[PDB]
From a paper:
of a GFLV-F13 particle is viewed down a viral 2-fold axis.
GFLV and TRSV are both transmitted by Xiphinema nematodes.
Author numbering:
A (entry chain CA), B (entry chain BB): 1 to 504
C (entry chain BC): 337 to 504
Write the structure that this text describes.
Amino acid sequence: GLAGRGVIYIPKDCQANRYLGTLNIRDMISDFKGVQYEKWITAGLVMPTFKIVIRLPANAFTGLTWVMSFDAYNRITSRITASADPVYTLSVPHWLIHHKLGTFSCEIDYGELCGHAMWFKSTTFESPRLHFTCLTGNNKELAADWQAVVELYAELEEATSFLGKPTLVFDPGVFNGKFQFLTCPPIFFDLTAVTALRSAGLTLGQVPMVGTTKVYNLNSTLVSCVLGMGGTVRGRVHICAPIFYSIVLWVVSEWNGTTMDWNELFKYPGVYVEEDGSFEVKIRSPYHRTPARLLAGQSQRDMSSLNFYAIAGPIAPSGETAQLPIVVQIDEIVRPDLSLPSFEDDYFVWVDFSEFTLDKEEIEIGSRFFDFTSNTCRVSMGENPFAAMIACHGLHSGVLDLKLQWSLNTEFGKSSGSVTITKLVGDKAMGLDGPSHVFAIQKLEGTTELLVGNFAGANPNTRFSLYSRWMAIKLDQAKSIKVLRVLCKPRPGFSFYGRTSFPV
Amino acid sequence: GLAGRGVIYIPKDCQANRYLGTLNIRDMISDFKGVQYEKWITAGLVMPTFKIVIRLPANAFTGLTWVMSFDAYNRITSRITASADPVYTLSVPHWLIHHKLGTFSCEIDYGELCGHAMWFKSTTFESPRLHFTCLTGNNKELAADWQAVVELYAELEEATSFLGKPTLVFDPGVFNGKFQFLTCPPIFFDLTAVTALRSAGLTLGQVPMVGTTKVYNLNSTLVSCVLGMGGTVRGRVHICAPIFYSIVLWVVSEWNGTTMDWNELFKYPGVYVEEDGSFEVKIRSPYHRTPARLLAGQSQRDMSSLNFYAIAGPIAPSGETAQLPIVVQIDEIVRPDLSLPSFEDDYFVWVDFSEFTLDKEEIEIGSRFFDFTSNTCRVSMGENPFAAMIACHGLHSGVLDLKLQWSLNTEFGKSSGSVTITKLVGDKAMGLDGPSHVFAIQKLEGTTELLVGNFAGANPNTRFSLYSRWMAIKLDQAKSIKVLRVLCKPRPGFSFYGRTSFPV
Amino acid sequence: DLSLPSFEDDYFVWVDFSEFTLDKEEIEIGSRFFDFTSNTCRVSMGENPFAAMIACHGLHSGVLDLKLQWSLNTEFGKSSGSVTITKLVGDKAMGLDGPSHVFAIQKLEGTTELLVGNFAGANPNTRFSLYSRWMAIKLDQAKSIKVLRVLCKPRPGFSFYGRTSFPV
């Protein structure tokens, strides 16, 4: 039944990118309080399937399109409260809300989209939010300020387990070609132009940016798992303007620039788009595939692109001035021609330690896979899809096999000491002794396993304190080491929960 | 499920007649608030079946017995908060709570015991209460103050109708001989006495008193519907003392005094009582029946009584000092020898008006059957079982046939004017005109019907304002009237809801 | 979930006449159910659903049973005269004589039927002139009456035609 509610205020002038507000999902249920809220207190833990309903007067004369963004791990909130770049709002699970369609509804399986069960008395990891932003603005301001109502419907029952089912399990050789929640920021057409071109890059492994901020997300991370891709792009086009705006588009794929000859343009295999609908366009390339990521100094336009040509319009009655926005969603690469996977089932670099200033150095790892920092030596972190996947999920869990390699800074004959791997259960202070391991420095390499997890079952992508196994690397002659490299190779079944994003 | 809760506080010295507290049933549910409370808000109206549970550490060493009294219409609250005489606490539906039995439970069909459905937002008539009082005290104080927990369990669902099913329907010729909630105040035996007698009167139509206060109740009212009764009294006896107290009773019926000869006493048909249990004793009388009520200067002992003779004990270890209490419950008269009904299916006196001081007099009746007052004339109200039944229920509804009779104060030849019966729907100010009726004073009598009820379906036994038909008697030559008598005769199906009591 | 009906199948108040200024008073009813006016006495009209229904339809037709009740203004022993119910077919001038009826004032009550209708079949809610039965109440000692009350009870099948409204 109705479990919780909230209100979004809409400014009489709702421009593209306006932050409209954030609702806190747990507060919606607890402020309402709530037949469902009271069932929750008894259950303790709930893994709801929500129906979210946004009540909203339908109107075809505004052109307004909003985005509801499900931010279960509070990753974009900080960055959108002034203004919400679409790159942020579309980097987490989200839904387009078209004003022409009025009242909106969708399902959120909290087991999938989030991954951990909700505790009645307090937030466990971070507090789950719904963000409401404006993707395409109104063509002219409306008569007055107004509001929309957000409602949560659910039948809460006691959760049997803490963890959901994993959204993703790590596998280098597996990127199907199907996507979810891959929405391109809006493309705009001026009505003061008789024709026009808008390119969308198809180099989908590229990490999106907002100014100097990189926004890592699961989709670009997935694509990066492959060297390149060919095939047909299946997607949907939304025309986000008032009924009295209209346009006709020729949508086609081109390689390295665009032709300047209108007649050549129409000898290509494209499709016409007059209205909201799906489309399929073949990725066009001399190699039949476009590369997954760019090299130094190449552009996305240098490769295969999805080109939107306005061949008639846009038109509108006078005196409208608003641009006509097109929102593109990419659903999958059908009939895919994939390259080799970019990585094999092999080790990859986690971290290099170098330039040691003290002979005694102790690197605490504990039960986490994360970015190191040191005041006493130089840390160089690895960048690879696995690390990105860690960053683009709320929770993860698994086992990493480690290979340690090191070279000497001093003469081999003078060398002494060891790379020691301390393995405990608990912490340095009260822990139990596991398979700790002393590698004489002359071995020049060593191996160990690392449990990434804890008694609860999964790690957040932050610092946390939960009883688990505990690991540390101890150097006693660190100045004799030119470099200590740590490689890892996830054991099968390394699991990720709740897709999200990670701005840096 | 658990719907509401509350706490009663017990003093280390809990003496007979201590008032322990009152819980407000609706507050218990709303303060808890409550999966059931929230279901209630949606239903609007509920007609619950409650399971009441009193949690209570069982103990055989105290002698403590409490009474929970269900006072849905707030009739005894005022009178028990200083001291709670058992006459008040047992005059409404109630339950004995024996300390030796520990945790206590019972069902309350709110449809029967109360009669009207509960409105989520506010009290409709009066606010339903549970009173907790001590019936028999502890033999010696306990070690410390303590508490008991009261719990309401219910599965609230929306009520289809406002009114329950009627507890009682008026019928002069119908008193079965079965009782509910007929509990006699505790009888006490001193342990400083080798034998003893305690009489319980069997003149059950007599109205119980607390000081100068009459406590009208349904049971005595029922018995008054008959001229007398013979047969066998079936009941239960509770011995309300610690396991280390014990007694043996000879229980027998006697007429007009008691025999002084122990040998004669045991030639009577009595029963022995050694412990908690049921009993059957024949009502002994020269006429085989004892009268339902007393005449002037008669005494309850002059008739048939139920006598409790302590023939062995009570005994207790030294140095106990408490008396041993016996609580008697009367369940029915089995194999009943009833007298004629005291009333036939006929009219009875509602009210006499006399001694008018003004020629213009207007008596407003409206839609109620109630006690009149006047500053301008003498009101003499009738006392009969019907009036008592009105007083001993929370709600009632039905139709009364009225006969009006009057005699002249002036000479007949000089007489003028009328007894006018105004009949409206609504009120004097905005009402519609019904079967109003002008009786020329010389008619000397007249008849009319009166609806006792309203749009909601029933009347409380208080002043209330609910749209209904409206009646008034209008005199224009009142000084010419020596007496205006109004008789009434309830039409079949006159209904009463929720048995209760009425102290005056 | 309905309440009781507000009215039962019973009489209700049509009109009270009171405060008579002349001993000779004659109230013409004819064949209509309507609001009375008098220059010589006080008219108090009843308000009930039946009267509203009469007002909220274009035409109506039926039969009303009447109960007349009255109380005296003078001393009973001095009373004389009558409440007379004149019943004609036609009009006062050329009519035929029906069940006219003389109630000695001392009876203090009387009954009669009234046809609400006419040869055409129904009455408008206005004044009209259509041949029908004709009724009048005749007082000869009206100053001796404190109040004359007229109750009516429609016989089954009292009919209304054409729903409408009535602003006042």
